[PDB]
Amino acid sequence: HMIMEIPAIKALSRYAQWVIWKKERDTKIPYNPNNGKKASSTDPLAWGDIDEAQAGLVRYGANGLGFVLTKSDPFVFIDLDHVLDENKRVKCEWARQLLKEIKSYTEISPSGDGLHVVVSGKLPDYIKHKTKFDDGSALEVYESGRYMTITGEVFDGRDDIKELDLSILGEFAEHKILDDEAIIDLMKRKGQWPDAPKDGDDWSSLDMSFANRLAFWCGKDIERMDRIFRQSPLMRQKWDRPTAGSTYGRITLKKACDFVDSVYDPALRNESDCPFEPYNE
């Protein structure tokens, strides 16, 4: 019950890497506990010690404590998203197996339906930071570059941070072997990024309007058009349904590449050649 009695919290209290956070829309924004300004996750002087963070939590009415991971500290943060049922029991088999294999400090997340594990160790080189599973759960692992919310809501009595080898995370996380995010950001700034379909929209007509825009902004690079489309609000299973010896998605993208005259060239920044008006908001 008493968060300062928890061994893991006493261990984290040695580091002046604490922030406070507040819920904003669907995100949790970290704040500098000494002056209440938004905190950078890479400026050490934006953080506090745990006493400062607890005072700041009170002073500014924040929702909770957070702890910033850095490459120099011993800590790895493992986030298990959407793995608990309504009785706070684990409902994902991958998560139950991870917790059998990686026994270290575990707390219930602020939403009440995920878990945080904190371990002393180093991530294997060959795993992705984020892995999504078919049932909506996810596994995220980080050792630096962001903060973690700290609840002190200890799960299954796992109240202490342990030194463990994390090679076993390769059993759970996916392996790994302009720029797409840069083109996505560009399209968003130009108002050329679609909204999710609404009731009574003709989705296939939305797809073609978007494919036409991708043909321009991606320079008729059909592989890049496809990667970006799959990250858009218009993605659905029909995209990959076989149709006449191709798929619905490939036929759509090839028709857009034939239909669109101009192309954006990042070397030329010819944004006024775009043939299509921005989407209405």
Q: Residue 108: phi, psi to the nearest 5?
A: -75, 135
| Residue 179 known to be catalytic | no
Same domain (yes/no): 14, 134: yes
Catalytic residue among 116, 143, 159, 207: 116
Q: Which of 172, 194, 197, 174 is nearest to 184 (CA)?
A: 194
Same domain (yes/no): 27, 50: yes
Q: Residue 206: phi, psi to the nearest 5?
A: -60, -45
| Residue 159 known to be catalytic | no
What's the domain range around 217? 178-281
- Domain boundary among the residues 121, 153, 177 is at 177
Q: Binding site annotation covers 104? A: no
Q: What is the 3-state secondary structure (H, E, C) of the chain?
A: CCHHHCHHHHHHCCCCCEEEEEEECCEEEEECCCCCCECCCCCHHHCECHHHHHHHHHHHCCCEEEEECCCCCCEEEEEEECCECCCCCECCHHHHHHHHHCCCEEEECCCCCCEEEEEECCCCCCECCEEECCCCCEEEEECCCCEEEECCCECCCCCCCCECCCHHHHHCCCECCCCHHHHHHHHHHCCCCCCCCCCCCCHHHHHHHHHHHHHHHCCCCHHHHHHHHCCCCCCCHHHHCEECCEEHHHHHHHHHHHHCCCCCCCCCCCHHHCCCCCCCC
- Domain boundary among the residues 134, 151, 177 is at 177
Q: Which of 70, 98, 69 is nearest to 83 (CA)?
A: 98
Same domain (yes/no): 31, 111: yes
Catalytic residue among 52, 79, 143, 207: 79
Same domain (yes/no): 46, 69: yes
The structure's method of determination equals X-ray
The tally of domains found in the chain comes to 2
Same domain (yes/no): 132, 195: no
Please give the radius of gyration of the chain, using alpha carbons only, rounded to the nearest integer. 23
Contact by Cβ (8 Å): 134, 167: no
Same domain (yes/no): 170, 209: no
Environment class of 81 (CB within 10 Å of its CB; exposed 0-12, middle 13-18, buried 19+): buried
Distance (Å, whole) CA 87 – CA 153: 14
Contact by Cβ (8 Å): 231, 184: yes
Same domain (yes/no): 172, 187: no
Same domain (yes/no): 120, 227: no
Same domain (yes/no): 219, 167: no
Contact by Cβ (8 Å): 68, 144: no
Q: Binding site annotation covers 79? A: yes
Catalytic residue among 52, 81, 107, 207: 81
Distance (Å, whole) CA 235 – CA 223: 15
Distance (Å, whole) CA 269 – CA 229: 22
- Domain boundary among the residues 135, 151, 177 is at 177
Same domain (yes/no): 55, 160: yes
| Residue 73 known to be catalytic | no
Q: Binding site annotation covers 221? A: no
